[PDB]
Amino acid sequence: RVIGAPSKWYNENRTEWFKVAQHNAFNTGFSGVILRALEPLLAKFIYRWRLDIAHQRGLTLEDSLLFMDRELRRCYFFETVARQNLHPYTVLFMKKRRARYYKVERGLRGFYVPDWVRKEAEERQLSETVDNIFNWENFVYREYMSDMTPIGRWTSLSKITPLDMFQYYGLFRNEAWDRFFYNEAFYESYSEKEKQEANGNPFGKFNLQTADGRAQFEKEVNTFIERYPFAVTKPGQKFDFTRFYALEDLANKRDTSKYDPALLESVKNELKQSAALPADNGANKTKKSKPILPDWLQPKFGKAFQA
Amino acid sequence: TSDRQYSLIHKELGNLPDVTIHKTHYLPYSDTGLFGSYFYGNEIFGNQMLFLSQMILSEYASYINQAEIYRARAKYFNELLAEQNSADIASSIATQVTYLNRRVPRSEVAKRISSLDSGLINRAATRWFWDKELAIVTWGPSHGLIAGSHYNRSIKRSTLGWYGNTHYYIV
Amino acid sequence: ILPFKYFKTKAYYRNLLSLRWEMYAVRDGVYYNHFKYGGYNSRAYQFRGYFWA
Amino acid sequence: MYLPTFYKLFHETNAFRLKRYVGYGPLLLTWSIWTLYPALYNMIYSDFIPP
Amino acid sequence: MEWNKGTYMSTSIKKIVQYFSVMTVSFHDINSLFGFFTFLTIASQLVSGTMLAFSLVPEPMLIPMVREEEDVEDLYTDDFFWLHERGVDMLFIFSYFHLFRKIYLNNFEYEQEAAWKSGVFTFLLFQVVVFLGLVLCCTHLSDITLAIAANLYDTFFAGKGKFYWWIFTSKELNTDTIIRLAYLHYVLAFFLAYLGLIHGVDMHYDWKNESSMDGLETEMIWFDEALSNELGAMIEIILIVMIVCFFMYPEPEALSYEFFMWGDIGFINDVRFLSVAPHWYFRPFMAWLTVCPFHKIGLFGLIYYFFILFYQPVIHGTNEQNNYTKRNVAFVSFFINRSDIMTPKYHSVEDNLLHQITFWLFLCSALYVTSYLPYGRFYNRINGNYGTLWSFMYIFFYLGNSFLRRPLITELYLFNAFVKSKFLKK
Amino acid sequence: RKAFYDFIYKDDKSAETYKVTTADPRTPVQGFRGQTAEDVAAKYEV
Amino acid sequence: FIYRDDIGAFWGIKGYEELVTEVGTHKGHN
Amino acid sequence: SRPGNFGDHIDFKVNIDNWFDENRVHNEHETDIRRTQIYTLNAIYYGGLLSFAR
Amino acid sequence: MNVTGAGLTHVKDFHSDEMRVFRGGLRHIADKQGNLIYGSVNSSVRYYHDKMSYERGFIQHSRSPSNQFINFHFMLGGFRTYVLERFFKQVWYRRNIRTFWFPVLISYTSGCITMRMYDNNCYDYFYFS
Amino acid sequence: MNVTGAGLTHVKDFHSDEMRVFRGGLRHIADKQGNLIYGSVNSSVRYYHDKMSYERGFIQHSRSPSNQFINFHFMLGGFRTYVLERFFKQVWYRRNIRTFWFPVLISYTSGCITMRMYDNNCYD
Ligand code: HEM
Ligand code: HEM
């Protein structure tokens, strides 16, 4: 054991850990080639299965991946965080969609939503869902995971059953038996090199500057969009690569000369409007209530001098 | 929460929301001495204020934690290094010469406390706290404390650390 | 007796679920302090002191 | 500056308490032996030293 | 008692009446009424058991004759005996369906923590009561069950000392043990009813019909709007059971598993050891004992089954750390180049094809274990049945290990899709 | 040795750390003494 | 889930291979 | 007749069905008759259950 | 010092009036006065229903069942449409058989094969010709 | 009016927060906070002792039994005097015998007379 600087107990973000883990699993080693060979089955039986069920219910992957079902009901931690940080309409709108489906579903089972609900569901793409999921996970980690400290304890509930009184926590916890002090150094972490590897493009090591690399990238993206409907484009639509290349070129601050000024202006427009935070203006206010006592609770009209 | 720190008595006090003041007094004299605790709080926590200090001291006789030992050692080191006022220094030197006919160096006191460990602390607290008689004074509203005022089984067993926990944890 | 059980249970549930819902915009300058500073839980006596500290 | 974990503190306290309890155990063993001495005699002289 | 914070609901008559008069139940289906079915059959079991106990004299040499005498001279004793047996069967079916439903719904979070331990304790008490009644049957099967229980109990003390005598005496069905086990059966049955009532009062915290939140705020009142549905569903279940039994169990039959009950203790001192066969609900345990001939390993497996049925939320759960626990798994084989793994969180139910596949494989494994009794003669000489061994191994692997319950492959696949989508649309 | 004495809760009078704690306050510790220093006027740097 | 009929074990119940069992009920209808 | 602090209907499809208007028999000139009929159906169901209980 | 909290902290205490009978001289306290202590399950059993719910611009309309169908929507579309399509395809198949037909088929086939092999071994044991 | 009590009367409400976990953000409430609701049995079991007691200017001294007699005020001034006089005269006769000697004697005499008449009739 090496004693270093003190730190918080949770020093790893779940999202970054899972990003590096999935990059290592899918783009490194024999497991990588196995997973890449198993891609069509996973696309058919995981992504498309859930997508079809959600579309039938009139929902998207929002309602199944942003906040879990066990979180929207009976989760005091999520309820506390939401009541302390969130505006009501997030959870309210998710619950409203659930209710608008299940009111009919409970009355008469086997319910398929009409086309005007399924279309509204399909309007939402997976990119905005990824933004919401990542932002929520990062916010929860930063604001609450970094504040808590696990402690050894017995059961939370007082159960008269002897089989439940003697429960032990921390005796077989890996982190608890790996670190005994808050000054202890951290062991077995992701390296900075492999952390930077996961920040590359998730398709391949080909470069987009060479014309040969662009063709392979376009083929891979076409296969991805053909296997993942509604993830990045509508099924009828076609992915345009010139705008993506302009985005990549502007992000890396390379020579953006081959692009016409109108397309560059547009690309900047979506770049700066897809990251804007919505703000409120006093546009259409509603009347505020100022109740007064009713007439029968008020003194009768008429007063004399009362000499 | 009060348990996320290295002081058992502070955890217990933080549990009680209307026990405001606690202080530990050591009053050495020539051929006698007193060591005890003063509590100031609400009347509904009278039993807690009556039993907590002796319970803690007796548990220290039975078993003490290295966290407690190191916290106390660091505190008393800092107290030794924090004397700059000349009036306090002069008074302390005068009292030390009065009672010991010498001035005790801070290095010597630091070495004396640093030589302590869990076993020596346990033996000292067995000598001075484990199964001992007490002097108790309560001053104030005693509506809830008049039933068991007399020096009785509860008070006698209060000095047995875990074996006299009955009347502290009922509140 | 099967038809009468169906009547009571399923028909009653289907009748009870025939509700009308309306949502309106409220912008009268009143904050949702009751949402931010509200909430109860019966298992708080179990959660307190142990969970999420 | 010696910041141990509350896991560690809890485990040490539990170890001390269990040591005290296992110390108390032999008293129960001796009480049981004095209560069921004929049964003990039967057990040893029927299993450990068979006729 | 400074580690006790109190009771979730203090059990008082007035508070029970008020709670049951203003209790509300959300809209549900037939798959979420097994608990009330179990309550109904428990009450019927109590009543029929009282009726039967008013005629059973606890003497092994008189029980069959008294049972025959009370049948012809009374109008309802045999009806109540039939009710009591069929209630045992329905109790087993409903309890197992309830447990399977909870396992499928993945009620393994800290909010379902309370309802799991109490339910498992109730299940153990129920099995003990069933064993006591089976011994009270006073036949050759009763003697075999008593001997098996005595041997397994003595294995705890390693065969030294007669520590079992206070309950089992000389491991035979004599008058003393008959009286003791009968009184124990009655008392433990009533305690079982109380424990089940406590567990059923512990339901209202997180009550759901499906694994998907429905978002509905209005719910029906229990006393009439839900009680009527519960009674009607009970009637429908009884009708289905009657149809299946009528068209599946012709009378007379060529062979039956109940022919081993012909032998009466005392009257017949010769036992037909070939056709040893218990009831269907202990058939899996007898099959496990036959498959694993080792006495210590068989007992270890029998205890470990309940040991892992309990601790289920501990092995699989959020653990209050919000899925930040680092678990140790060797199956990942350092594919992601790490030893400890973050626990996944996207474990849905209604759309998780892999979870459904694994759960239904486990359920069919349990059914196959229950399906038949391995013929102990020449069983291991002919290498036995590979399917039985595979089913036992899969059950133990599924209930114990967390590799299949909350897989990491779906979680990583979802992050791969998320990363690709976000790279494409910055 | 030290573990055994801690287990039995009896003081080991031969322990080297036992003499220092139970030493007479009127006399200095047997084998220890600090260094004597003097004050120096303070200096400020910005 | 399927059991043989020519091994003498009716419907998977074993132990009665040493006698004729099914004549009254299964093989013939008395 | 909603309160003045309630504005316009927000652009959210809250209802997929119209069972509030489709599930109607338009018997507002005789409602106690339907109430009596519902009582009678409940009575028949309860009578079957009470026969078994008897 | 001679104040609540000793002049150091705010205490936030309350007098329950649960063990009190009179307001003034022989004037009884209201029976439901104890219900005014909010967030206490000892005051009411309705506090066990602790679902999280908050909304502000919501209106709900409910109608008496005596003005509705006794059996609404029971056989709309006829036997074919309603029963066959809705019940079988949309509920039974779509919600159950999709989930378990494959594992149940695999388990049933494997169990039949294993049972047949075990029975064949038994037959070889019994018959030597 | 939108105020509590409708602008007509005072309500005297309270927020017990015994079904709350946190004060602010992830700071737990002290577990003894529920003891600050005075005069409730659910707060503590010590409320079942409900005698009436009020006093000022009172000082009470109680000594430890380890500095007292094991058996104080035992045989004092003589076994005869102490036991006989104090115990017998000042306890038994003074409190029990003085109260029931006359009714018990009358009842015994009547019962003996009735027994004599019954036994004489039985003999006859
Ligand atoms: C739900 C709780 C109960 C269960 C699970 C249960 C279980 C059983 C079982 C499995 C049998 C053996 C029947 C057979 O041969 O298959 C049985 C028999 C019996 N039970 Fe129960 N029982 C319960 C409640 C009771 C009660 C409350 C009583 C007494 C008041 C009771 C008294 C009896 C008697 C006397 C017999 C023997 C009947 C006979 O041999 O003719 N049981 N019970
Ligand atoms: C096998 C062990 C058992 C376990 C692990 C268990 C666990 C659970 C769980 C987690 C729930 C909550 C379901 C949900 O959240 O939707 C529940 C509900 C319930 N359980 Fe159990 N249970 C068990 C056995 C039993 C038994 C034997 C009974 C009957 C005495 C029972 C009676 C109930 C009742 C009444 C409900 C409420 C659901 C309803 O009423 O339909 N449980 N159980």
Side-chain angles (χ1 to χ4, degrees), chain E residues 8 34 37 43 89 132 157 163 180 182 221 241 243 254 263 312 341 349 360 396 400 404 409:
Chain E
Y8 176 50
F34 298 132
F37 299 162
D89 286 4
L132 288 179
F157 302 96
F163 288 92
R180 281 158 214 212
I221 196 79
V241 164
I243 287 179
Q312 276 285 323
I341 307 297
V349 168
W360 282 108
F396 283 140
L404 306 157
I409 177 61

Side-chain angles (χ1 to χ4, degrees), chain F residues 6-38:
Chain F
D6 291 331
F7 192 82
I8 318 293
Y9 289 110
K10 300 279 172 169
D11 268 321
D12 174 296
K13 318 298 210 314
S14 307
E16 201 53 47
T17 182
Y18 177 77
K19 272 81 74 175
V20 187
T21 59
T22 66
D24 199 41
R26 264 182 282 117
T27 51
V29 298
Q30 288 78 244
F32 169 73
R33 179 65 179 86
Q35 286 81 244
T36 297
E38 202 42 56

Side-chain angles (χ1 to χ4, degrees), chain J residues 6-108:
Chain J
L8 296 171
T9 192
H10 181 79
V11 169
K12 187 180 167 274
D13 57 309
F14 185 63
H15 299 258
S16 85
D17 66 60
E18 66 182 1
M19 293 183 286
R20 299 193 72 92
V21 176
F22 309 110
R23 326 192 212 191
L26 269 65
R27 166 160 207 239
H28 289 228
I29 308 184
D31 47 318
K32 305 288 105 174
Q33 186 74 227
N35 296 73
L36 282 177
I37 303 179
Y38 310 124
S40 198
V41 169
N42 299 106
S43 312
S44 184
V45 298
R46 303 173 180 275
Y47 276 105
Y48 275 115
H49 207 67
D50 47 351
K51 299 289 94 175
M52 173 171 114
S53 88
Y54 181 80
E55 177 148 17
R56 309 174 65 186
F58 183 72
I59 291 177
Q60 190 201 82
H61 316 265
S62 168
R63 179 166 266 123
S64 158
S66 292
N67 303 96
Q68 291 172 325
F69 278 98
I70 297 298
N71 193 2
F72 174 64
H73 214 302
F74 204 54
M75 295 296 172
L76 208 66
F79 160 78
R80 287 180 191 87
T81 61
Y82 173 89
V83 169
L84 294 185
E85 308 254 6
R86 198 204 45 89
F87 174 58
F88 279 117
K89 306 318 175 177
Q90 307 175 42
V91 184
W92 279 19
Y93 187 85
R94 187 47 185 211
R95 301 186 73 96
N96 314 320
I97 300 179
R98 191 168 179 248
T99 61
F100 61 70
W101 75 265
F102 168 70
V104 163
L105 170 63
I106 288 312
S107 284
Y108 186 77

Side-chain angles (χ1 to χ4, degrees), chain E residues 143-205:
Chain E
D143 175 37
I144 292 297
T145 54
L146 181 82
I148 290 312
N151 286 30
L152 277 296
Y153 178 82
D154 199 14
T155 310
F156 263 79
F157 302 96
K160 64 90 176 179
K162 301 156 292 286
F163 288 92
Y164 45 83
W165 199 280
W166 68 289
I167 49 172
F168 298 154
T169 69
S170 84
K171 309 171 148 160
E172 306 170 348
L173 279 195
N174 53 19
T175 308
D176 304 293
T177 194
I178 286 301
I179 287 185
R180 281 158 214 212
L181 296 183
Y183 293 169
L184 197 63
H185 175 73
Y186 309 161
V187 171
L188 288 193
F190 277 100
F191 184 48
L192 187 156
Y194 171 68
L195 277 192
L197 188 153
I198 284 298
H199 167 103
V201 167
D202 215 354
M203 71 167 260
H204 197 62
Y205 184 67

